[PDB]
Write a structure and sequence with these properties.
Six copies of one chain form a homohexamer.
Chain A: E1 10-20, E2 24-29, E3 35-42
């Protein structure tokens, strides 16, 4: 009995109740990025870069 | 009995109830990116970069 | 009995009830980034950079 | 154009999302009544007695 | 254009999200009544007695 | 244009989000009544007695 990675809960989302009541919803993108409406999301990275919002970068590595 | 990777829950989403009531929903993209409406999503990466929102980058590595 | 990684809860979101009542919702992006409406999100990184809001950077590494 | 019984909604249940997560559920009745777990129920009576919970009455009209 | 019973909503339940997470649930009745777990219920009576909880009465009209 | 029973909302329940997290729930009735857990319930009576909690009365109209 050593339990190194024992009973864990990592990056967990549970017991969520949402009610969305919108009459109109608009998104007009012309460049870059847009991220909307992220709900009940979970991740678990090991040796890596974990993102849940965007990188949104015009990476212009020129010449 | 050592339980190295014992009873885990990693990157888990459970028990979710959502009600969406929208009359109109519009997205007008003209460039870049748009990500909407991500619900009840789970991931687990090992030795890698995990993303749940977009990279959204005009990677212009020129010359 | 040593319990090194014993019964943990890391990066956990539970028991959430939200009610959103909006008549109109608009986003008009013309460049850069926009991130809206992130609810009940959890992450757990190991040896990495974890983000839940965007990088939003016009990385212009020129010449 | 008079619209006496015009566009009505009476006794209506709509847009319901439920998630029930129980490990054990028991009911041990020995007399009378038991009513459990009534969800998303609608009725419309005209000239009558409408019930959605039980009468539960040992009507002992004796002699 | 008179609209006597015009666009009504009477006895209406809409846009409901519930999440129930119970490990054990017991009901042990030995007499009378028990009513549990009534969710998202709607009624509309006209010239009548409308009930959504029980009558629960040992009506002993004797002799 | 007179709008006698115009655009009404009577006995209406909408936009409800609930999250119940109980480990044990018990009800041990031995007589009378018990009513528990009534959520998102709506009624509309006309010329009648509307109840949403029980009558609970041992009506012993004797002799």
């Amino acid at each position: 009995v050593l339990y190194v990675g024992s009973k864990t809960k990592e990056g967990v989302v549970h017991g969520v109740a949402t009610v969305a009541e919108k009459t109109k919803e608009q998104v007009t993108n012309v460049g870059g990025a847009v991220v909307t409406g992220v709900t009940a999301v979970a991740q678990k990275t090991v040796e890596g870069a974990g993102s849940i919002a965007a990188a949104t970068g015009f990476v212009k590595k020129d010449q």
